[PDB]
Amino acid sequence: TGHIDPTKEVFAQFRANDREGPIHMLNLVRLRPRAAYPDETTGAEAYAAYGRDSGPVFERLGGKVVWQGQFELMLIGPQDEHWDHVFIAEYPSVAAFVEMIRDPVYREAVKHRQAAVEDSRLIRLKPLKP
Amino acid sequence: TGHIDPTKEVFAQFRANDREGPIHMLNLVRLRPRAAYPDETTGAEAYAAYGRDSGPVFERLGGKVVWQGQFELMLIGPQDEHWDHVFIAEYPSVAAFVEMIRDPVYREAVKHRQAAVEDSRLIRLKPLKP
Q1: CA distance B127 to B130
Q2: B contacts of A127 (beta carbons < 8 Å)
Q3: Residue range of the domain that includes A99
Q4: For residue A119, what is the domain's CATH number?
Q5: Hey, is the C-beta of A55 within 8 angstroms of any chain B C-beta?
Q6: Cβ count within 10 A of residue A63
Q7: Residue B32: CA atoms inside 13 Å, Cβ hemisphere, count?
Q8: How many CB pairs under 8 A join A and B?
Q9: Is B39 helix (H, G, I), strand (E, B) or coil?
Q10: Which residues carry the post-translational modification N6,N6-dimethyllysine, per the record (chains A, B) (predicted)?
């Protein structure tokens, strides 16, 4: 019962949608303590790898991390839940995002994320006026 | 198994913390379809009540809704989960926030929220530099 990567089926629903707008990716990551590489690192080291490797691609296709906070408390919700990273990445198009997922460099660097995450959420949002 | 309002115990932990900074309240609300007033409305009407009534107080004590998006997809996560409202409210101090929860007007207007929500999350975050 840990969600690390998306479904074949659900990812289609994502590409299916493609309104022209930008998109907001709410990311809720909970790292595991012992990273899970086939082939000794910690979770947070393993995630930072992904980060160091993902960025260059995301920068290039025009992703930007808009907002990001530090988990302090779960005021409403199950005490079990606790996220180690909370942030919103913006992409200018569903197409920009897809093109990243297919990039060689990304594809290799997600192997790191695949090994660092105990559980994640990734929600697609159409940003609105405050 | 639906989380509407915080615990006595956990709310201490909140007041306990009080770093000087601002705070970011990530709000994930899932409205129910038939509102649950003691005393016939829909959920979304019942929530909009809370909104109309909570703003004035929150404006006054210096809360502001910074960001807000519209749920489109759950790319990573359980398909069961689906949020009807996603937003981040900013308060200038843990103290500002508490003082709101105690306000007469708020206290009456949360009765509406109490009746509209099927399930929610409310996470406290110390915002960081992107």
Answers
A1: 9
A2: 67-70
A3: 1-130
A4: 3.30.70.100
A5: no
A6: 20
A7: 17
A8: 135
A9: coil
A10: 64
Give Cβ neighbours of residue B39 (< 8 Å, ≥ 6 apart): none
Answer for the pair B44, B90: CB distance below 8 angstroms, yes or no. no
Alpha-carbon distance A39 to B22, whole Å? 43
User: CB–CB of B118/B31 below 8 Å?
Assistant: yes
What's this structure's resolution in Å? 3.3
- 3-state DSSP call for residue B80? coil
Spell out the residues 6+ positions from residue A108 whose beta carbon is closer than 8 angstroms to its own.
A53
Alpha carbons B54 and B36: distance in angstroms, whole number:
19
Asked if A104 and A19 count as a contact pair (C-beta separation under 8 A), the reply is: no
CA B109 to centroid of chain Cα atoms: 12
All residues of chain B having their beta carbon less than 8 Å from the beta carbon of residue A64 are: 130
DSSP string, A34-84: B-------BHHHHHHHHHHHHHHHHHHHT-EEEEEEEEEEEEES-TT---S
- The total of structural domains in chain B comes to 1
